Amino acid sequence: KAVPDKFQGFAVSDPKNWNRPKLASYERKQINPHDVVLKNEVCGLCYSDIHTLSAGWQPLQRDNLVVGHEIIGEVIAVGDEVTEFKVGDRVGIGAASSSCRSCQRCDSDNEQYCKQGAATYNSKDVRSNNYVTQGGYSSHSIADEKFVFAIPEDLPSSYGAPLMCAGITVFSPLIRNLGLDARGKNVGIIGIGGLGHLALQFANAMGANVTAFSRSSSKKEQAMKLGAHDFVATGEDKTWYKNYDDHFDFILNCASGIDGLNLSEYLSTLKVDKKFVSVGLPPSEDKFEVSPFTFLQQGASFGSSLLGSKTEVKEMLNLAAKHNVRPMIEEVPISEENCAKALDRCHAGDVRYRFVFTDFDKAFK
Amino acid sequence: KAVPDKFQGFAVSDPKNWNRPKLASYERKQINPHDVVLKNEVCGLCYSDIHTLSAGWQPLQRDNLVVGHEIIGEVIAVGDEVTEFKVGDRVGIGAASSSCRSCQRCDSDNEQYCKQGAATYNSKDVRSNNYVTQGGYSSHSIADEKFVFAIPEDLPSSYGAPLMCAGITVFSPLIRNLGLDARGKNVGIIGIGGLGHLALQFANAMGANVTAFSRSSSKKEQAMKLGAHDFVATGEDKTWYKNYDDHFDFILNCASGIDGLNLSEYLSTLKVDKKFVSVGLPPSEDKFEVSPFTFLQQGASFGSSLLGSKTEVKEMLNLAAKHNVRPMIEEVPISEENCAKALDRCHAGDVRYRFVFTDFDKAFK
Numbered sequence: 028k029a030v031p032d033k034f035q036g037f038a039v040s041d042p043k044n045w046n047r048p049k050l051a052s053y054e055r056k057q058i059n060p061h062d063v064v065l066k067n068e069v070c071g072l073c074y075s076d077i078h079t080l081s082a083g084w085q086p087l088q089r090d091n092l093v094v095g096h097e098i099i100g101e102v103i104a105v106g107d108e109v110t111e112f113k114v115g116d117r118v119g120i121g122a123a124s125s126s127c128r129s130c131q132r133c134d135s136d137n138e139q140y141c142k143q144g145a146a147t148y149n150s151k152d153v154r155s156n157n158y159v160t161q162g163g164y165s166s167h168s169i170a171d172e173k174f175v176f177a178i179p180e181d182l183p184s185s186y187g188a189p190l191m192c193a194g195i196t197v198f199s200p201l202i203r204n205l206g207l208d209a210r211g212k213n214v215g216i217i218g219i220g221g222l223g224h225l226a227l228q229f230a231n232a233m234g235a236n237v238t239a240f241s242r243s244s245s246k247k248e249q250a251m252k253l254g255a256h257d258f259v260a261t262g263e264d265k266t267w268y269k270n271y272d273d274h275f276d277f278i279l280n281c282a283s284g285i286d287g288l289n290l291s292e293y294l295s296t297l298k299v300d301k302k303f304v305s306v307g308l309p310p311s312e313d314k315f316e317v318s319p320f321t322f323l324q325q326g327a328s329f330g331s332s333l334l335g336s337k338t339e340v341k342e343m344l345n346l347a348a349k350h351n352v353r354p355m356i357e358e359v360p361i362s363e364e365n366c367a368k369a370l371d372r373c374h375a376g377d378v379r380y381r382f383v384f385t386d387f388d389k390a391f392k
Numbered sequence: 393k394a395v396p397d398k399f400q401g402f403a404v405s406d407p408k409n410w411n412r413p414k415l416a417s418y419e420r421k422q423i424n425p426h427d428v429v430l431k432n433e434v435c436g437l438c439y440s441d442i443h444t445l446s447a448g449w450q451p452l453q454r455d456n457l458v459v460g461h462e463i464i465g466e467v468i469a470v471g472d473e474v475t476e477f478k479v480g481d482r483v484g485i486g487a488a489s490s491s492c493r494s495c496q497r498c499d500s501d502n503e504q505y506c507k508q509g510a511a512t513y514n515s516k517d518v519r520s521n522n523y524v525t526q527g528g529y530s531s532h533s534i535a536d537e538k539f540v541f542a543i544p545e546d547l548p549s550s551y552g553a554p555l556m557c558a559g560i561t562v563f564s565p566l567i568r569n570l571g572l573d574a575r576g577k578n579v580g581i582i583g584i585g586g587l588g589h590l591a592l593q594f595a596n597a598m599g600a601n602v603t604a605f606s607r608s609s610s611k612k613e614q615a616m617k618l619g620a621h622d623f624v625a626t627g628e629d630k631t632w633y634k635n636y637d638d639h640f641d642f643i644l645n646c647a648s649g650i651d652g653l654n655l656s657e658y659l660s661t662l663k664v665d666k667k668f669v670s671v672g673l674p675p676s677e678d679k680f681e682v683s684p685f686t687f688l689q690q691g692a693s694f695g696s697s698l699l700g701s702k703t704e705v706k707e708m709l710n711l712a713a714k715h716n717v718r719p720m721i722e723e724v725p726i727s728e729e730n731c732a733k734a735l736d737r738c739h740a741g742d743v744r745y746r747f748v749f750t751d752f753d754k755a756f757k
């Protein structure tokens with residue numbers, strides 16, 4: 028076989044050592060007819076890697092677990108039923124890897140919402156020997172065909188990797204709630220991190236009037252460069268909603284704190300029958316209180332959004348290359364000392380705006 | 393001589409006496425150039441009246457508070473800028489009475505969502521020197537012509553009274569989330585009461601598969617003949633949600649409270665990016681509970697809907713005369729005792745499905 032029986036990746040097993048992963052060797056996942064095998068070249072650092080490594084939402088489902096789900100690599104092998112990719116193709120893998128392939132979500136462009144699906148890391152894929160999936164801090168990654176995305180040749184590897192998760196996580200609710208042509212529509216982006224910095228460019232490229240939201244004005248100058256048309260410092264202008272009455276056609280909360288948030292203020296600026304969508308929030312199960320009076324005077328709604336569809340990924344890469352929508356990244360050659368450096372900085376938000384791991388040929392044998 | 397200076401009505405001034413309304417005479421509101429003066433003939437009982445009188449949402453905003461917001465009356469006087477109604481017309485008044493007449497929502501068929509709007513009762517009208525509005529349990533009513541609705545000469549007044557609030561409040565979220573052509577859509581209505589029993593009829597006229605939701609097996613076939621294609625009792629089938637996985641296109645909640653309302657279970661049955669709209673308003677201290685893990689699996693939404701448009705009222709009355717959409721009422725001659733009898737009965741669920749007060753001349757003239 029052209030695929031080794033063991034992969035190499037930077038992994039942890041004790042959640043106390045979430046920030047200091049060590050190199051480990053683990054057996055591969057079984058390759059089913061609809062699976063694609065990659066040789067990883069780059070893998071962006073998503074914040075949900077820190078969510079899962081520290082076991083803040085759910086414990087670790089395996090020992091020597093490799094995270095990272097912003098993968099871009101080269102196909103070295105495919106299943107006997109794969110028809111969209113051949114050996115040598117440059118493709119990418121997001122935060123999900125397996126699906127039902129027989130439900131209704133998979134047939135109606137919603138495979139990322141399939142109840143029997145498996146994530147890229149820390150997930151038991153019942154279709155593959157109930158293997159706890161391994162992420163992209165690895166030498167190689169395996170995924171189903173509908174979660175493998177073809178990379179255009181004009182989009183470089185190190186810059187298309189953050190789009191495999193962070194990009195699609197903010198693009199999916201934008202196109203679904205604003206339409207691909209968002210001209211004449213006012214959109215709102217809360218929090219300018221790895222998710223927010225990409226949402227501003229995509230919303231701007233779609234033609235919407237973008238408003239960047241944060242507590243301070245520390246990121247005002249940088250958000251205006253990223254495509255925001257105005258800025259609001261929710262900590263400095265505490266009564267900012269007075270100048271935004273009946274304005275926003277949609278508001279996207281990009282992983283901003285759902286502890287110090289004031290939904291009453293953001294909802295007071297929505298149009299009628301609009302929605303407030305939160306992405307990148309940690310998947311915790313403690314129920315919060317909800318009242319209908321919070322959305323009454325605007326007909327508004329509150330909801331979540333996870334990942335996107337494969338057809339949305341294609342339209343995202345098409346729009347990203349058409350409008351030159353690239354994420355600001357900090358390249359970091361993958362290594363035991365380098366992963367601990369970026370994870371320590373990414374947890375504190377000390378990045379502008381996405382850590383991308385490179386030079387996989389130098390780290391793994 | 394045309395309009396008296398004081399109106400008569402059955403009012404309450406202490407929240408402890410919510411179910412013992414007294415007959416009192418209060419100074420009427422000023423008649424502004426767009427206002428319509430009615431001689432009330434009928435008025436339905438809506439559970440918002442109980443919540444208002446019981447201070448379940450907020451304290452009484454005035455002394456001697458007349459409630460009721462399903463008025464069918466005869467025009468006895470009009471302003472000078474009125475163009476739609478003349479003296480002697482039979483018309484209706486819902487739960488809203490005025491709006492700013494200068495926003496975009498007032499010109500975009502959303503005058504019910506006006507920021508400076510004033511309810512029919514228990515609300516300060518900034519266009520009438522902050523006069524707290526008075527309801528329809530009264531001799532006369534005053535409302536802006538944009539919130540006064542004409543009644544067809546075929547519809548009886550007592551049968552058309554519930555449509556001024558109960559009908560429009562369920563018709564508007566239905567027409568906006570389904571359209572008039574809801575062929576194939578799956579609708580779910582919770583709380584088969586005043587609004588619920590009408591929502592089953594309107595959703596049936598849309599051509600959509602209706603699934604009624606009750607707390608017990610009572611009102612079962614009563615909802616079947618109304619228009620519900622399916623029926624589930626919340627208190628019995630504790631695991632009903634397992635059979636509705638990815639089935640509902642829209643869920644409208646018309647319940648008065650939260651006892652027996654599992655929001656996480658209702659969100660489990662929605663399709664991806666579908667809305668859970670709640671027109672029902674429990675007491676402010678009562679709230680639904682749902683975990684963030686439920687919002688993310690379906691990508692669903694939770695929201696509210698406040699009343700409806702005037703153009704939607706004209707539409708609602710059109711499809712009413714087409715599919716014989718008529719409420720089930722119980723006419724009550726208005727009194728100090730019959731009101732208390734209806735207040736105590738309706739609070740305990742002893743009505744199918746909406747009380748309508750009649751015989752106003754024997755109580756006022």
Ligand SMILES: NC(=O)C1=CN([C@@H]2O[C@H](COP(=O)(O)OP(=O)(O)OC[C@H]3O[C@@H](n4cnc5c(N)ncnc54)[C@H](OP(=O)(O)O)[C@@H]3O)[C@@H](O)[C@H]2O)C=CC1
Binds near residue numbers: 606653
């Ligand atoms: N948003 C708006 O613009 C409007 C909102 N409303 C709100 O709509 C709601 C219903 O109005 P109405 O239809 O007059 O009320 P009804 O009492 O006429 O219908 C109430 C139904 O809700 C269910 N229910 C009763 N008690 C409870 C409880 N404690 N917890 C949960 N469900 C319960 C029952 O259905 P079952 O027995 O089958 O469960 C009952 O039939 C009210 O809360 C009112 O405030 C009213 C007018 C307009």
Ligand SMILES: [Zn+2]
Binds near residue numbers: 073074076096192193
């Ligand atoms: Zn991610």
Ligand SMILES: [Zn+2]
Binds near residue numbers: 131138142
């Ligand atoms: Zn599936």
Ligand SMILES: [Zn+2]
Binds near residue numbers: 492496498503
């Ligand atoms: Zn207005």
